Point group: C5
Chain length 95, copies 5
């Protein structure tokens, strides 16, 4: 048990490994928040995806989509991350 446990507490490895444990975790509470709740409110939009033809010589030549409104949800991803975390850092810490 010595090799793994006692090397843990040193230096910046505990400041960081658990910190990218916070970067991926919280931004999933809040991204999967965007894209499950809101991106369907952004999938009711639909006006996008003006038809496109790409004739692949391997035979995919019916049509394609140039679909824009998930870019609209890509800001719903970033902003509400940057809203769910912007509230919690400013209130107890930034002051």
């Amino acid at each position: 048990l010595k090799g793994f446990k006692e090397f843990l507490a040193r230096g910046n490895i505990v400041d960081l490994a658990v910190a990218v444990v916070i970067g991926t975790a919280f931004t999933a509470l809040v991204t999967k928040f965007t894209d499950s709740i809101i991106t369907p409110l952004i999938n009711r939009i639909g006006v996008n995806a003006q038809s496109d033809v790409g004739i692949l010589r391997i035979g995919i030549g019916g049509g394609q989509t140039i679909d824009l409104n998930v870019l609209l949800s890509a800001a719903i991803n970033f902003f509400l991350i940057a809203f769910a975390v912007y509230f919690l850092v400013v209130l107890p810490y930034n002051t």
Copy 2:
């Protein structure tokens, strides 16, 4: 060996590259748990996702889901990462 091994041991490229190797590995364990186990208990819930009528100008007109309960399985994703790391990594360090 010289170009790689010698410039292996330096600086933060270990405390910081290996530390985003603890981030993914521990949060590819516990997140892959959250949806292996809990989300289909939350997907047993199901009563979510009242339909969302989005008529694409490309021609998909059946229907869409404003699909909630994987959001509920994202709080399950942020919370239960923050407890499995609160005991293995925090209880023998913070104490």
Copy 3:
């Protein structure tokens, strides 16, 4: 709320853990900017991927694709991340 929200703010666990909240959340606005808008414009290219005849022991032995231009949309992926990170973040900081 005490042991949690006040161990919140000490050291590099705020600067680093949310900089990867900014690592994933910022690029997702601009990566998905390049994949909903551009990669479909790069699906109009379509030329690349002359077939590959490759069998498996399961048995898939019809045809493969040796497909390039998403390499040519992965490059559009790295570049505009660099442009969008250079404008809102670096242009007010490099000054």
Copy 4:
């Protein structure tokens, strides 16, 4: 070329970015080893996840699987990243 190739050698960007270039790169060799070689021996466990009768008010009424295979595979996702980083990076460094 001066704004790019002289702001790079400053501070910790080289030690920190190339690091998360190491972080994701290395576990991309190890987590996929987990899930390509082993996770499908873990789907050879087979008997997991007795059907989960979940009533959706919206249209799915046949069954739900809650597969513990991929949790036990996530245990193969965190244990096996630990060995690959301990042998190539730590044995000549911890010594």
Copy 5:
């Protein structure tokens, strides 16, 4: 306007968050080159999916797979992450 683009620039976040921007985007370009130029050549090899038998008592029991050269589709990006970075980022820096 102010509190955003002026608290933006302080400390290491314009390093760190843009440095993990470097960790997200660079590995993605080299890995999709690895996934699009190369997967074809690698799915021509067919080392993957050696037939296996895993009895789901929940009803997938026809034939299974144990993917071996998806391990071989992964080594190609980890090393090429370590090869594409060495020419663009390292050779004018290590000098």
